[PDB]
Subunit: 495 residues, 3 copies
């Protein structure tokens, strides 16, 4: 959404993909042990990547909606299913007038690779409805998200075993609660797992802890996994830890709000927030809760008391971490050289262009790629789907057993020691640390979503770092991610 650096979104991801695929093409051919080796392996690798790139299924919908004034409006909509190498497909629904089959094809291709980076067992899919939800009433929105769902279900583009959606820009809990309900009510009344047909749902309708803040929490973790690796902080020329540093977020939505929230909590200082109508600034810090508070009461952030209204690209604030948490293609050729930050935390899906990437590369700015950084969402989504399939709130059946097993464990160590040091020690009590006391009943659902997220973010950071160093990609972390993703997906097509 720019001027003279606005590449076709799908091809822009194909561009990233194609790059990380030459980095491994040698590795893939060497891997494949096919008896007809040769270039008849080089090419059967060439064939396989050629099948991965294009979305397998796209469905373009035109369906009518009775507006609230009575009039009829033909509402446009698409869901692309990138890959089935794992079913079901996974990916959000976006309500925007930028929605096009190519944008939605791209977000789709971005989603399989996002799930490969964090080893989430879904092929990618994405959906968009070409509307601007500020122009519609809640009742209209409901009328839309439901009719969109009925069309998806009858053509096989939603369903717990075939394709599971999620939230995105201008969608969220509410519209997730609608989709779930119209599918379960119609196409899947007999389907035991009907409410696993979409993620992002309200806690009470089958959703999971922290799903709303999930993408932003995972954003904090991806940054932490690098903000603390001195290997890179050296190459950057700045010091480890969050306690030093300063950041600005583009976008105050589910991603941005929660990206701010957590970075602030662990010490970092938010100097600048912006949305589609302006940006505010104050190097002394902006408290996410006051900002949020103000945002909720005023429909905008502009004119926040404890900050100035910043004239100028927030992308170009003076800060250490810039977090694009709005939409795509916001860091482009023309404005990359003015970025002033050292780290670009890609909250959003593909907010930086290939050619901004190259500016950042040689300008020694670390772009942490969307592929990995915003996969907090699908992770905690996958957890939500898994919650649905399992039909049990994590911990429920085992809390009392482990609280029990653990005192009996602890009591074993007590008794053993008292058996030996009869009265020299006397009564050796063996009791939980405050922190083991919290852990003592086993993981709760909240427990699993935080730790399982961390585990994923730290592990997928690692195999990005291990892969970045194995190929000397330096700060080009993006293509390192597409290397692991291309790697894993090819494996499925391979065997």
């Amino acid at each position: 959404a720019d001027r003279e650096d606005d590449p076709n979104f799908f091809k822009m991801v194909e561009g990233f993909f194609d790059r990380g695929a030459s980095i491994v093409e040698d590795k893939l051919v060497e891997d494949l042990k096919t008896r007809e080796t040769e270039e008849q392996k080089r090419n059967r690798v060439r064939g396989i990547l050629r099948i991965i790139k294009p979305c397998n299924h796209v469905l373009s919908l035109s369906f009518p909606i009775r507006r609230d004034d009575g009039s009829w409006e033909v509402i446009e909509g698409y869901r692309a299913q990138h890959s089935q190498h794992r079913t079901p497909c996974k990916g959000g629904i976006r309500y925007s007038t930028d929605v096009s089959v190519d944008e939605v094809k791209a977000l789709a291709s971005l989603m399989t690779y996002k799930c490969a980076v964090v080893d989430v067992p879904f092929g990618g899919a994405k959906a968009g409805v070409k509307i601007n939800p500020k122009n519609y009433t809640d009742n209209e929105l409901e009328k839309i998200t439901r009719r969109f769902t009925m069309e998806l279900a009858k053509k096989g583009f939603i369903g717990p075993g075939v394709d599971v959606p999620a939230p995105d820009m201008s969608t969220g809990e509410r519209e997730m609660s609608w989709i779930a309900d119209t599918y379960a009510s119609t196409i899947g009344h007999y389907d035991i797992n009907a409410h696993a047909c979409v993620t992002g749902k309200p806690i009470s309708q089958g959703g999971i802890h922290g799903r709303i803040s999930a993408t932003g929490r995972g954003v904090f973790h991806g940054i932490e996994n690098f903000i603390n690796e001195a290997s890179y902080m050296s190459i950057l020329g700045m010091t480890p830890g969050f306690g030093d540093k300063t950041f600005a977020v583009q976008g105050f939505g589910n991603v941005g709000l929660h990206s701010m929230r957590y970075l602030h909590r662990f010490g970092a200082k938010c100097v600048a927030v912006g949305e589609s109508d302006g940006s505010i600034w104050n190097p002394d810090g902006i408290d996410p809760k006051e900002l949020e508070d103000f945002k909720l009461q005023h429909g905008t952030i502009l004119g926040f008391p404890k900050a100035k209204i910043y004239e100028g690209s927030i992308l170009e604030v003076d800060c250490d971490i810039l977090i694009p948490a709005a939409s795509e293609k916001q860091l482009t050729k023309s404005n990359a050289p003015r970025v002033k930050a050292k780290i670009i935390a890609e909250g959003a899906n593909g907010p930086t262009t290939p050619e901004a990437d190259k500016i950042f590369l040689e300008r020694n700015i670390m772009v942490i790629p969307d592929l990995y950084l915003n996969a907090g969402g699908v992770t905690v989504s996958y957890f939500e789907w898994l919650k649905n399939l399992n039909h049990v709130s994590y911990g429920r059946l085992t809390f009392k057993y482990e609280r029990d097993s653990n005192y009996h464990l602890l009591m074993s160590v007590q008794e053993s020691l008292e058996r030996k040091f009869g009265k020299h020690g006397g009564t050796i009590p063996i009791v939980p640390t405050a922190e083991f006391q919290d852990r003592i009943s086993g993981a709760s659902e909240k427990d699993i979503v935080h730790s399982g997220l961390a585990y994923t973010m730290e592990r997928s950071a690692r195999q990005i770092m291990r892969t970045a160093m194995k190929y000397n990609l330096g700060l080009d972390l993006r293509t390192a991610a597409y290397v692991n993703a291309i790697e894993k997906v090819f494996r499925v097509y391979n065997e």
Copy 2:
């Protein structure tokens, strides 16, 4: 029975609901953050509350049977589903002549509120067939069970993801076995979950441990949690603990007997048991096992040696704990004044009417409401359903692994204690407690049923107790319960 206090079962439970519905009314109202405020909320609340109360679907059957002698007899039956706010619906099949669409309706609703109290994710449901089983041969009872399953199946009132029935009065393992068999042999031949279609099954047919005795056991756990609470035991004027307590039991069925078994087990003296033809009595104690033996032997509890035949309402026996475990509407305004017991443990479904509830409160008899006490049934039926869904005996895959790990964990405390106390300590064997040795391979199925039930019946007892004290219901435990059932259900309907 009772002819002057025979309220229509559905409206009666509707009453209990409404009551609890009022005390939350201000709470629910202030919770919901709807922007359109003031009293558009208060309507919203009794608007949602007005959808909860009525049953969504009720299915009336008339189907023919060929009796043994060769005649044709027509059997009528019903199944009511009260909610789908949780899929599937859960609820028993009862075979009595009292069955009417209405009692099946009230029973179903009761099941919805029940599962809410007890955090089981099922909407309530219930069936009934208008036969006295006693009057049919085993072969006939089979035909009736099967054809009634086919009717429920075709019209979609049974199925693992729609509606999982279960036992009730005059049905047990045997019948569920036939239900599960004709379902899975016809409609379910393809369902990987065909045997999750019903619960209460023979363990050999998909059942779970202790599902027969599970509602009895949950009765005990429910009584215990209060009887061991000094706050209520002061108010009630009785000693904490089961040691000094005497109790009587109306009904000697699945929940009748096993309630006796577990209460007798932990120290309570069962002085009297009743059935549909009379009661027996002995304030020196009746042993469940001897009584069970005699009953299976002579089809009647009457004429049991070690206890006299008690002339009169066993409900009115002198005792600590009165446990209705028969049909509904047995403690009424007629006989509520002269009950004698200080704790009513509603093992049966809706056994004390609201008129009695009133007397009991200002008499300061404590009523543990069926809502919370007999949920030990679904809770294990929920476990059985979960067992079927997972297709593994709990523990099977982890027994050895957990056995080994605890051993190496224990070993690490040892090798570390010796690493410090070189030889003044010597060799310090760290060994499992006899009880941690039982708990060393991890929880078996049995362990999950026992412990999961215990956790459940207490976690729910606490938030009942907490809600009694927050709204000063004192001993109106039922009203706190519905207050919690409502609060949890309402949360679904609006969010």
Copy 3:
């Protein structure tokens, strides 16, 4: 093919089953509660058994294939399903020219009793296709197994909850991956468990760790569980353990190879390998990894540098353990007199005829029977089917949480101890041993596969031993197995 002791495979297996039944007939009768005592107790038992013996269903197939050369070829095939007392049926697919309806029938019956022995909740089934796989192309072997999958799909002889096939002779990962796909391509396109329709799948395609290796790994465990019971090695006249031991293996396929791997890993010297074009032999040891490389490089074992072409029945090689791991009816009345080994571990399916079983009995030769010994297969098959159902890799969500739990757990022992022993201890570190360090995150998938298998095999080993002694069967391990399989399947037969 033995020209004087070739019983019809099905009847032969019926004999083993008959044998065991008359042993527990008195047992089944006495347990049977039945009011109708007497011998109408005996006759229901024998009627039920009369139901268990015959296969419930057999599908015979004729379907044409157009060969690579463009000619038309009528491929015959079979699937028999023997029991549904557990759904789905389980059992391998076999490609051979021996595949007859009677052979397929026998193998399927062998599956139901096999899973009964190892407590794998599957009725048994088996399919063959009457082809020499050596005589067809990869392309032709795909058209065949794909069309066979379609024939099996459309008549209900494959489906994740109806009948889950798996590998067997001349089938493997590559065929399973086709079955799985062909099924999930078509019929199962909406099935959330389409990929659980078959086991043996590649790991990237829903397979499980070590399932190729699973069966012989259980052959190892099953031998191990017997080779270490002094009671049985006494009777035998051999030393406990693998230390000094020596074995020959008929068959070098998926059972033969890994049986030979694992036995070799834990001591034993493999002295003969054999296939269908001959045997090799070397008393001083055949290293399995060597023989694999040579096999893989030469498509045969004959002329393996480190052994001599053995001439003469591999079944009569001098060794401690003879392992038939090929086809059935290898050890027959003609050559059983000449077998020389003391433990016959039946990794194959039905390798030993009944007349040869008799000879082995009175020769004091312990045949560890197929029924139990090669059930490592289904068990790990079971594990993968569950893997597919649970849609999560084992441990994924709990690793990080368990790590921190154990560290705080130990940290609790540390600080508790330091609180007592102020400075007379000083700093009392408590750390994981090396072994508990490996388990400190919880069980990985392979962890479960390895310990789950081992658990299953030791437990099943025991209940066979337990049965043998109680029935004074001594070395008739087979009848002990059938006696458990009959016991277990019966008792499901309750209405």
